[PDB]
Each structure stands twice: as structure tokens, then as C-alpha cells.
Amino acid sequence: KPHRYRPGTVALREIRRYQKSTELLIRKLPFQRLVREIAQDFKTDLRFQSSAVMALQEASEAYLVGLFEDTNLAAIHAKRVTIMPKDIQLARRIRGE
Amino acid sequence: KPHRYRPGTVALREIRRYQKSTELLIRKLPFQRLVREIAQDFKTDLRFQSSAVMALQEASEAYLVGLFEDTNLAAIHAKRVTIMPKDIQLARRIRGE
Amino acid sequence: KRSRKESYSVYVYKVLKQVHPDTGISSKAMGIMNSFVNDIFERIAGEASRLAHYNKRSTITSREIQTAVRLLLPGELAKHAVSEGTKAVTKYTSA
Amino acid sequence: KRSRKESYSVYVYKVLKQVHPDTGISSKAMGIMNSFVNDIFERIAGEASRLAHYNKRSTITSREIQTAVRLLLPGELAKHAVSEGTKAVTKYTSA
Amino acid sequence: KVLRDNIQGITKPAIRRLARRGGVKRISGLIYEETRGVLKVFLENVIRDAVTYTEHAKRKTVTAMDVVYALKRQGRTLYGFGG
Amino acid sequence: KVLRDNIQGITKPAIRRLARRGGVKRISGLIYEETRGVLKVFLENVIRDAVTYTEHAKRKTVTAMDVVYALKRQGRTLYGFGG
Amino acid sequence: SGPPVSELITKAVAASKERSGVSLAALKKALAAAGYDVEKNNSRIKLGLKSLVSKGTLVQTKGTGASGSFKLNKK
Amino acid sequence: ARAKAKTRSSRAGLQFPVGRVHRLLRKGNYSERVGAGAPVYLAAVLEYLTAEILELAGNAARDNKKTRIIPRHLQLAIRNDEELNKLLGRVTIAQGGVLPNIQAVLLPK
Amino acid sequence: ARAKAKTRSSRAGLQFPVGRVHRLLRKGNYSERVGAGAPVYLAAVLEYLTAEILELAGNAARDNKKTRIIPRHLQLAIRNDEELNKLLGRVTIAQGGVLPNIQAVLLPK
DNA sequence: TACTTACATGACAGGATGTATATATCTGACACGTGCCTGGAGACTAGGGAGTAATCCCCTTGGCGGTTAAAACGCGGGGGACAGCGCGTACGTGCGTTTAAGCGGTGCTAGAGCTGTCTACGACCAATTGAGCGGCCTCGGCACCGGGATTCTCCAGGCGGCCAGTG
DNA sequence: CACTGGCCGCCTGGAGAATCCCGGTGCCGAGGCCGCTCAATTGGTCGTAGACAGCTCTAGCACCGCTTAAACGCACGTACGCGCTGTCCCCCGCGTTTTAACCGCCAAGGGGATTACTCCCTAGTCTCCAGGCACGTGTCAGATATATACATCCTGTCATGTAAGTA
């Protein structure tokens, strides 16, 4: 039978691999499409520098992973390991946004 | 039988009474002594304006109020009606110190 | 005597009687409003300085401070502030 | 024809070779150090400007930045920067 | 030219890989859409500020300098893009 | 001359009243001492700034305007004593 | 009216017979399938559990008190 | 033969002093120079802000049947507006206390 | 007829440029006057900061046995120091990632 | 098995009390009147920054041809979340005592703070230069690739202990 | 009640894939050198800002006496978290399938940026004058006081469901 790891240890393998990693986890082209889509909602015909799309990508990545460590702190407060939207809302409320 | 109220009801009335209140909640003279005490650990024979003692009083109590609102959010997030100092510690950790 | 110590108290009194002629004011609330005026003013001054320096502008204009309001003031408060300031500057430019 | 964009390149490379002669740089990390020096400069300069505003002094002396470095930078980093600046200004006055 | 549904452009494995960088072992099924929403409002704030910076500069091409400035004045200063 | 313990003067009932303002309904006994500690830390942070300001002001009595400025640095700008 | 609810508890716990004891979740949904106001009778099922554990007809598998999971006795 | 001295606040129809805010910008060291419409716009912004928060303060005081504003009225004015709270979340009111805010879970049944 | 050109940085024995920081303070508009010890003091502070962070980056790169520093090394340098996290709690580093921080409960057993 | 009975648990009612609700008073802080002078502006000027046209070129935008990595989907399933519930449990709450803060009351002096000096110092222009950045190459430290070792991670046999079955 | 077999939980030994780990190959970005240029420097002057010196006068330091709420500690009811044993179900993981992102390449022009011109605008400064600051002073809103209604809330007695005994 083909080999199968227990639920979770592949996730921790990803944890170790990606904390040793530095590479941008968000796909570049749809992120650029989303930035253009959001900006077109506010001001029309907006062009984005490629480096600007990049800097937005590390912005989104670092903001989200910071909020994710924050929610993991909220989860280990809540005796849980699977984070929930209410952890996210808690982080949003106690951070003040 | 002398009349006695159930727990939390007096506590809730206390909560309502001092949210309704606007006055200073700390005894003034020991606060003045404590800020003089901490001051003497930094420079010798320092003196305080009464207004500076006032402003440190309202700021100290308000910062503590901010920590207890954060404490309340964490405590209900922890599904507890009795708070623990680990909730305050998590609140301090998320608040950005 | 003493040196004159400045405050915005008279103008808070003027707008207070303008919008509510019947009401009173206390000294502690007056200090709160003076602190509010100082705080909002220094925030807008800081954002205006940043916008001026980013565009290498040696002057802060109504465009700069309007931008600074759009940054600081949230939403429909910012649109009403733009409307009020635009009406004020049109009245001022009408001399 | 290109216009020069100023940075902190050769200075951070010099302090690197003085602190580690055999360690190199990447360009991205070099941009990180440029942004670090710019951010810390902005923090110290803005805190100094507010200090000069507070005491009504029209000038930023070494004592203003000494105040600011006890303010923003905590403890060991602050006092050792104080020591570096102290011996630095004594050497500057001696030259 | 118009784009409609780029909220799903940040894919579910992209969110999972973010939370893998985010120290998150298990991610609930409700996380993805709501994190898409908070990323959306975050980018709404940041891009609104940056677009205001650009049109204050009378520019039409958004630059990374205005992005890092929009980040910095929200207390989110970024290193490595000319900030 | 010197004082060695005034932090207990921020009394257990007073800490209870402060948490009653925040809506805390039940308080375990562990919290009061750590709130005294973090208040010591916060007042240490504020009053370190305050003595640093006052020493830069070359004064030996702290003014309330020093307090407001020190709180403005820390990010908890306090209304009611500016000026 | 009808029969007492403890009989319903006994048939509900005898219906399944897992290798381990039955916790309150499967028990309360067995009563819901049989038909019972489980939301308004938490105290009634608590006193029923206390009665059935205390008198010695039913034995507790691994839990303590009314907490945990429950199986049938030896005979 | 100097003209009669009018005020820039009256020129823009404002109650805030254009002169004092302009002086505070010029001597507050925020730019080398200041465009003339900027202090007028600024005084208009602060006049609208102070005016409507005094609107909320007066209406809250008339709700509490007292005619004179205490800082509790200012806390009740600011904290009861969501958008002002987005403006002033991190700001402490002296003697304003706390907005009446009780979580429904810790309220009894 | 003229004194030989001698920079203020070499006078102080610092290699951040004193004239550059003085220039950037003069046209950064923080005050209309700047004391002569102020920019050399600031350059000394910055040189100690950069020397400390490049020492940490160099040791991190040696432990990663790479000759040239990468922003991962800078992220490791910042996050593994307490007072630097005090200095840069709200700072984003491009392509630095995060410090290896797994919570104790996340590990098995 | 239905019928009758008696107690735990809610259903219903009611009185004490704290906080709200009805005026009475006197007080001082708030509203208001007065001298003024410090500050608000008016006009001219110096001069300086910034708005605008051109353009160009380079960097972005639009377009195509494969490519599997990556996205997406489906099933197995171990694992995470958790509902409730005894159970020890730790804390709210009532209440007399104590004491130290609060009120209120005096000396003063040391220190906050205003004012005249004059010096220390900084800002700024012309000339000159030399250090610092753009350009470019070149090359070896690094980017990429191929094969064992070990580490990790699941799996499997053995022993014991526990659990169940029978005479 | 004692014997005894059987099955799972942990101990113990095995096996194979993912990534170290070790060796091998090219290539690109680091940095070193060259060219440039502009910014840092210095001398000197102008001017002016702030420490010094001295005074003065006001609020904190210092001390003193009466009082009652702060508090505080004990009693005691009594609300609390939480481990836990399951159960429910829900993403995690391991595949297969599919598709569009990435790469690589190609053509277009948009506007970012630079230079130049020009003119719009705004600080500075003297001066004149005027409106809010300082200061003084009266005075009703409320701070305090005394009597009353109602939440409220917890508690006393009934209703009902239900468990238990029984013909």
C-alpha cells in the first residue's frame, strides 16, 4: 500500500520548510489582477509598476502572516489549534481595526 | 435572615456604577507617593506639580481600563467569566509591546 | 501682570453658541476641546508635511491639506470636510 | 541621460568590511539597510523636532538627540549610542 | 478590461501557504473567504491611501514609493522598496 | 526618607474598581499583582520619558505638560492638560 | 405523560452497544430520534443519570459522575 | 489711507481664527512656506469637526437634562460615533470615563 | 592660499558622512537651527546601529555558511535581538520572511 | 399496567432596598463687563517654487506558444472542536474595625519662572575639491543538478496486562 | 471463585521516502575599477538665540489636627473552569486531472521624468488698530439635602412533572 502520513505532520513539514523559505507565497499574476481590480473600483485606468505589485505582495504577505501568528496566539489561548474567523475578528478588535 | 445578593449582581451593579461615574477611581495620596517612589529610582529629590499627578492619575487609570477592555475581549474569547492573568498577558502580547 | 496664554476657548464658545445658543460649557470640557483642536491640528500638519516632502514641495497648499484630510479623516466625514473647506475657500477667494 | 539617486551604499559597505571583511551583501539586503537608516533617521529627527517644539528652543543640539535616543531606543543600545556620540563629539571638538 | 472576481485570485492553497508561513497548523474551511475579505479591506485602505498619494502627485502610474508611504503612515513601515 | 513599597497603595479594591470600569465581572487573585507590575512598567516607561523631558527642560519639578508630551510619544495622547 | 424517561435512557443506551461507553451526545440524539424535549429537560436527564449510576443497574465506563461515557453492567 | 481691518475668518465666514492656525502652521515648522488656502481649509475642517461634536455633546446633555457640557458629554459624543472612533480610538478623554458598553454574554439571562 | 579639504566625519573618526546627515536635517525641516554636535551625534548613533546589525547579520550568514548577506539574515538578526524588536516592532522586511517560531503546543507529543 | 402519591424543580407572587425621582439652598464657577497690548492684518516688495508644454524612452501594457507546477477535486480518515457535567474550587459579597486618606488649615522656601546680558554659535555665500554614485565587466560564490545517508515516520511482531469467558 | 485464553497497548525492531549532504557544473550579480559631478568643506561674516545672572513670588514641601469611609480580613454562600469521554464532522493528506502562470518572445505607446519658461504666490516688514487675554465680579445650575416610587431581585409559597409505591 502507498505510504501516507498522519494528519498534521505534513502541515508541520510545511511549517519547517516555509519558515526556512523566503519565497513569495502569493501567485504573482492573480495578485496583480486583484490589485488592478481593487484600484479600478476607486480610480479608473490605473497602471501599476511591477515593483509596486511586488511591494504590495510583501505587504499583504507580512500583514497576513503577522495576523496569522496573532490568531494562532488567540487559538492557543482558546485551547485550540485550528484557527477560526472569530480569532481573526478578535485580533482585529483588540488591535483596534 | 439578613438580606444577601447573589454573586455577580453586586458586581454588575458596580460595573454600571463606575461606567456611569467619571471621577478618579484611585486614592490620590498613595498614587502621589508611588510616582514619587518610581521617580526617586530615576533621579534624586524630584518634585511633582499637582496637575502632573492629576494627569498621570487619569492616564494610568485609563491605560488600565484599556487593558481591561482587552482583557474582557480575551476572556470572553476564552469562554470564561473569571479572567486570568494569562489573558492580560496575551492582550499585552497582541497589543504591540 | 502675566504673559497672555493662548487658547481656542473663545472660538469653541462662538461655535457652541452658534449651534446651541441655550447650552453651557465647563472649564474641564473646554480643556478637552483645546486638546482636541491641538491634536487634530498637529496630525493634519504632520500629514501635510509628509505630502509636501514626498512631492518635494516647499509649500503646503489647499491641495496638500485636502489630501491630508482624505488620508486622516475617514469616509463621509472626509467628504463633508471637503465640502465645508471648498465652500470656505470659495467664499474666501470671493473676497 | 540619467539622474543620480542618492543612497547609503558605500557607507554601509564600509561599516560591513570594518565589522566583517569576508562577508558580502546582496542588493535586496542592501536596500533593507537603506530603508533602516532612513526610518531610524526619520524617527530621531521627528522626535527631536517635537522636543525643540516643546522647550521652545529653535535648535537641535546634541543634547536634544541625546534626549531622543534615551526616548526611542531602550537601555543598552541607547546608553552605548550615548557613549559613542559622546566620544564622537569630543573628538569632533578636538578637531 | 473590467475584472470581476479576483477575490478568488488569491487561491485557497495560497491562503493555506500564507498560514503555513503564519505558523498555522490547521486552517478551518470558513477561514479562506473571510481572510480574503480582511485582505480586501486591508488593500482597500492601503491602495486608497496610495492612489491618493499618486493623484496628489498628478500621476497615473502607481509607484511603490507611494505604497510604502501608505504603509508607513498606517504604522506599517516596509523596508526594501526605497522607503 | 526613601520609600520602598507604595505599589500596594494602588489597592486591591481600587484595582477591582478599575476592572469594574472595564466591564470585568469576576477577577481571580492572580491578576492584581501583575496589573500592579504592568502599571509599574507603564509608569516606568512614562516617567522615564518624563524625567528625560524635565532634565532636558533643566527643571527639577515635573510639569503636566511633560506628562502630556510623554504620553503623546508613547501613543496614548491624553486630552485635558495640553497647554 | 407516558412512561418514565429513565426507560427511554435504558433503551437508548442498549440500542447501540459500542465497545466503549456512550457519551451524552449520542444519548441525547438517540432521545431526539425517539422523541424528547432534550433542551428543556437537562436537569431531568441529569437526575436520571444520577439515579441510574447510583442505584447500580448501569456502570460508568471511564468517566466520573454524570460526566463521561456509560455502558451496561455485567449482567 | 489704510483700509478697514477685516478678519480672514469673516472673509471665509468662519469662526475659527485663520490667523492663529496660520501662525501655528508657520511657526510649527511643517514646511518652508504655506499656501494661503491651506489654513482656511484647516480652520473650516476643525470648525466642522468641533461644531458637530458639540452638536452631539449638546444633544447628549439635553438627553441627560443638563445644559452645561462636562467631559462626560464629550466622551459620550465621541465614543457614540463610529467614524469619530475611527479617528480617535487611541485618544484618552480626561474625566470622560468609559462609554456605556456591556458585552451581552456577561449580562445575565 | 587655502586649507586642505578635510571632512567632518574623518575629524570625528566616523564613516557615516556628517555633512550628509547635516544636509538632510537642514532640508528635512525639523528646526530652523541645528547644533553642530547634533549631526555627528546622530551619525555616531546610526553607525553603532548599523555596526551592531551587520555584526548580527555576519554571524547569521556564517551560521548559514553563506558569504553574502540575504534579507533572511537580516530578519534573523532583527528577530533574535530583544531591543531591536523594541526598535522595529512595526517594521516589514522585504523577503525576510519570519523567524522560525513554532509554538510549543504545535509540536507532536 | 394504570392509578395514586409526594417531593425536586420551576411558577407565581411579594416586600426590602438601592438607585432613580419630587423639590430646597447656597455657592462658586461660569457667564459676563473692562483695560489693553499683543497680536491680525494691509500693502508693497523680493523673490522663489511650482504649474505647464515636449518628448522620449523606458518601462509598462497588450499579445502568443507551451509547460507541467499548480490549482482543483474526490475519497479515506484521523483528528480537532466541543457539549455537558461532576468536582474541587477559588472568589464575590456582607459586614464590623482600623487606619490612613480626606478635609481643612498654617509657614516658606525652594523652585518655577520672568527679565537684562552678552556670548556662543549657527546659518549662509563663493570657491574648490575629492569622495560617492552610475556604468560595466568578470568571475567565483552562488544557482542548479545528480546520487547516498540519515532522519523521520509509519509499520509490524512480541510481551504483558487487562479483560472476558467457563467449569 | 479460580482458571484461562484472547486481544489491545506499549515495547521493540524494521523499512522506505524527503531532505540533508556531498559532489559536480555553469552563470550572474558583486564588487572593483573608471568616469563623472555635485555636494561637503572652509573662511569669514551677520546676526541672533539661549545660557548666565538675578530676582520674585507661588504652589508644592512640610507640618498639624479631626473624621469617617477605605479597606480589610474573616465568614460563608456560592458561582467557576476544566478535564474528560466520548461523538460529529471536517479539513489533511494523498492521489488524479486540468489549466493557466511562468517563461520566453514580440510589438506599442503612456506617461514619468526632465528641462525650460514663466508667472502665481507667499513670507517679511512696517505699521495701525482691534479682539481676545487678564482680571475682576455677580449669580443661578447644580452640589448637596431631604423625602418618595419603582426596579429588582431574591425569596416565600404553590404547580407541575415525575419518580415511586401499589392494587
Residue numbers in the entry:
A (entry chain A), B (entry chain E): 37 to 133
C (entry chain D), D (entry chain H): 30 to 124
E (entry chain B), F (entry chain F): 20 to 102
G (entry chain U): 35 to 109
H (entry chain C), I (entry chain G): 10 to 118
Quote from the publication.
Here, we report cryo-EM structures of human H1-containing tetranucleosome arrays with four physiologically relevant NRLs. The structures show a zig-zag arrangement of nucleosomes, with nucleosomes 1 and 3 forming a stack. H1 binding to stacked nucleosomes depends on the NRL, whereas H1 always binds to the non-stacked nucleosomes 2 and 4.
H1 is absent from the stacked nucleosomes of the 4×177 array, but is present on nucleosome 1 in the 4×187 and 4×197 arrays, and is present on both stacked nucleosomes in the 4×207 array. H1 that is bound to nucleosome 1 always contacts entering linker DNA via its helix α3, whereas H1 on nucleosome 3 uses α3 to contact exiting linker DNA. In all ten focused-refined maps, H1 shows three DNA contacts, similar to what has been described. We show that, with increasing NRL, the linker DNA emerging from the stacked nucleosomes is more relaxed and permits stable H1 binding.
